[PDB]
Amino acid sequence: MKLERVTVKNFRSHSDTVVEFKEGINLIIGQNGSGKSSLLDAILVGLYWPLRIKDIKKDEFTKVGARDTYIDLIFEKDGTKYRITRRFLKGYSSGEIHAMKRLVGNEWKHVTEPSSKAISAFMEKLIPYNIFLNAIYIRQGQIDAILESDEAREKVVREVLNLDKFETAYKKLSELKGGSGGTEELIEKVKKYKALAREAALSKIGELASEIFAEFTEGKYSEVVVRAEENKVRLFVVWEGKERPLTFLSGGERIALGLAFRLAMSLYLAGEISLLILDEPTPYLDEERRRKLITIMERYLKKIPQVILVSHDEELKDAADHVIRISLENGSSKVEVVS
Amino acid sequence: MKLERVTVKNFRSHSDTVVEFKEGINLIIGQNGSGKSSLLDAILVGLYWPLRIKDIKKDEFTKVGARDTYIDLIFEKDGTKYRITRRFLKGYSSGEIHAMKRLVGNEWKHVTEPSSKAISAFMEKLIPYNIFLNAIYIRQGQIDAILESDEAREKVVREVLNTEELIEKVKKYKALAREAALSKIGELASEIFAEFTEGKYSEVVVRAEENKVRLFVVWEGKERPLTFLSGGERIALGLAFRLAMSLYLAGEISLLILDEPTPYLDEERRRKLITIMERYLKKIPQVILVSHDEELKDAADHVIRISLENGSSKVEVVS
Ligand SMILES: Nc1ncnc2c1ncn2[C@@H]1O[C@H](COP(=O)(O)OP(=O)(O)NP(=O)(O)O)[C@@H](O)[C@H]1O
Ligand SMILES: Nc1ncnc2c1ncn2[C@@H]1O[C@H](COP(=O)(O)OP(=O)(O)NP(=O)(O)O)[C@@H](O)[C@H]1O
Ligand SMILES: [Mg+2]
Numbered sequence A: 001m002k003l004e005r006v007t008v009k010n011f012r013s014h015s016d017t018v019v020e021f022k023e024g025i026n027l028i029i030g031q032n033g034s035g036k037s038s039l040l041d042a043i044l045v046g047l048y049w050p051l052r053i054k055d056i057k058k059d060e061f062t063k064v065g066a067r068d069t070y071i072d073l074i075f076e077k078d079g080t081k082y083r084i085t086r087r088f089l090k091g092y093s094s095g096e097i098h099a100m101k102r103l104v105g106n107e108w109k110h111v112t113e114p115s116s117k118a119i120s121a122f123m124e125k126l127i128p129y130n131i132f133l134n135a136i137y138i139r140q141g142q143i144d145a146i147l148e149s150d151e152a153r154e155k156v157v158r159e160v161l162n163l164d165k166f167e168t169a170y171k172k173l174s175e176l177k178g179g180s181g182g183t184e185e186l187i188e189k190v191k192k193y194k195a196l197a198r199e200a201a202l203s204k205i206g207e208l209a210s211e212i213f214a215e216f217t218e219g220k221y222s223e224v225v226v227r228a229e230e231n232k233v234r235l236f237v238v239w240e241g242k243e244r245p246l247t248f249l250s251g252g253e254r255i256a257l258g259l260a261f262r263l264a265m266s267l268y269l270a271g272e273i274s275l276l277i278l279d280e281p282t283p284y285l286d287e288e289r290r291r292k293l294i295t296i297m298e299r300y301l302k303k304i305p306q307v308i309l310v311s312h313d314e315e316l317k318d319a320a321d322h323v324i325r326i327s328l329e330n331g332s333s334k335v336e337v338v339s
Numbered sequence B: 001m002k003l004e005r006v007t008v009k010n011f012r013s014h015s016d017t018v019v020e021f022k023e024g025i026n027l028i029i030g031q032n033g034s035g036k037s038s039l040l041d042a043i044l045v046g047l048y049w050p051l052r053i054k055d056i057k058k059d060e061f062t063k064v065g066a067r068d069t070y071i072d073l074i075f076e077k078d079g080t081k082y083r084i085t086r087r088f089l090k091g092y093s094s095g096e097i098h099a100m101k102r103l104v105g106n107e108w109k110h111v112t113e114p115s116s117k118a119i120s121a122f123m124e125k126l127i128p129y130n131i132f133l134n135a136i137y138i139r140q141g142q143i144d145a146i147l148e149s150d151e152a153r154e155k156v157v158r159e160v161l162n163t164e165e166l167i168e169k170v171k172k173y174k175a176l177a178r179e180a181a182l183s184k185i186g187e188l189a190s191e192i193f194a195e196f197t198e199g200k201y202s203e204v205v206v207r208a209e210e211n212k213v214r215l216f217v218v219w220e221g222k223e224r225p226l227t228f229l230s231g232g233e234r235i236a237l238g239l240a241f242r243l244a245m246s247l248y249l250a251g252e253i254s255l256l257i258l259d260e261p262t263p264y265l266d267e268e269r270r271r272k273l274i275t276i277m278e279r280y281l282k283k284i285p286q287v288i289l290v291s292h293d294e295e296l297k298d299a300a301d302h303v304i305r306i307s308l309e310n311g312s313s314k315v316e317v318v319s
């Protein structure tokens, strides 16, 4: 998956903004209240409306003084370039218009009926909503969300592992029944092989998270243990040779672990999904940890085909591949392409 | 309320720590993983055990390698000096000792039966737990908690604030006292938030409605909902409202403990925080501030440094 162009009119601080995204680390740099998250949430609205997210509401997100909100997103997936267009009318949801098209040669052509329902169904088939919200787009303040519960984590992990190319093949063979030694034996074989493949994926996620978290904490925590048990995915950190629960960590260490785990999932998915969007990675991190973040950008974020990073921290500029500066001018966001 | 001395043995990273708190801004500076929040949570445990907070578990907070945890707190309230002492023994219960005493004449005297239940009951009457957690000690990550719920805000405020036709006039004075209290908090919050945001938001509106306390920010002359704010702005508003509440109660409570005020703040807002420490935090008789941000040392009255050496917190008194 690759975002190419985002056009936004009258969404929060954005009156008329166009952003071209590219390969590599795209950094959006801006002060508090400049329009960074507004841009990222417009992308989320563009892709997945209707949302049932409490802090995102149409009546609220229309720019003050305007009546009409417009979002136009162009992205690539599996070789096909897609375009989704949405228009919202403030306080009057009957002028609301939605469209999703694909690029056929030189022409944009409808890929489904121009309706929220049809577009939603199509998008869900392209990239499941739960995968996007919990493994691709990490909203401001949600870095440690995947640490807080054996509910959201188990679900996203299971759904992430479900993206494996052989998953549907496994499930099918599991359905046949001849009551024969051949059928039973084969289904048992498939079930075992699938379980081992998952365990390997989870081990690989644990390996990556361990390497990143050890780098982050200068070896203070020697491993991040990721263990599937029944309907749970357990997470531990190893300190002085033994597994400890996540409450062992400090507030800053928790952010560091969240980043480690997010990155590890994105790296495991670098081929299948290939996109990470991260909004303000520095909260609670001390000076040393922010420095390590730059190192981890160089060594890990560079290994994900497309990354969109948003921050107020100027020191991250040097580690990005493309820099866009956003600022608030006359009550409207202004976007400047630096790199 | 004033904190005087906290003594901690084998609590998280603390093998053996003593900290003396004083009047004014007490800043504890330390890196990630050094022992700052551990110290503050030990104070919470010391005062209000048993707690039913998910991330604070007796079986977990005993320092690794050790068996016995000890917390000893000295504090003043309403002119009386109190000492609470707790000893925990991991895995077991009946071996534990809890005591609370007051300075009568020369020596410490039990205020109640030396038991968790009796002490809990006494502490609740002296300083209700809900007031301590919601208005006095703001835990790491909780700065904006008070921004979340009209009804939750209502409860905190409610607790922190408190012939045949004579019943009609009773409700009148009550709603008037309430509205005046809210107006003052609003005024204080507005002043602080406006300074914090360089006048981007001209006012913070704190409005009484039945069962609720509504919160709005004024932008370009109109009230907007809290969702209008950016992430960093929300932190600044949380700080403004917390400070406003502490300032309103400076004569009754007089203590504020804040853990890591700088998350999500940009460089400009972090510099502004220092100005706000100088102008407002210093109006609160005792403040305990802990942070990894060295820049904050500027406006502190007393500075303590904490660092982790060979697996244990070490406290250094700088000033
Ligand atoms: N409906 C609206 N109309 C006009 N402006 C709005 C509207 N809603 C929100 N805003 C403003 O949009 C600004 C930017 O919000 P946001 O994009 O979340 O900030 P940010 O760049 O992500 N900064 P931060 O997270 O604090 O570092 C806010 O400061 C609001 O003042
Ligand atoms: N039972 C324990 N025994 C020994 N060490 C522990 C124990 N529990 C937690 N720790 C350690 O205590 C350290 C300090 O935690 P904490 O006091 O929360 O950090 P902090 O100083 O507040 N830093 P931060 O919030 O990240 O800026 C942690 O980093 C853990 O390694
Ligand atoms: Mg933001």
Ligand SMILES: [Mg+2]
Binding pocket: A250, A251, A252, B036, B037, B038, B140, B259, B260
């Ligand atoms: Mg802390």
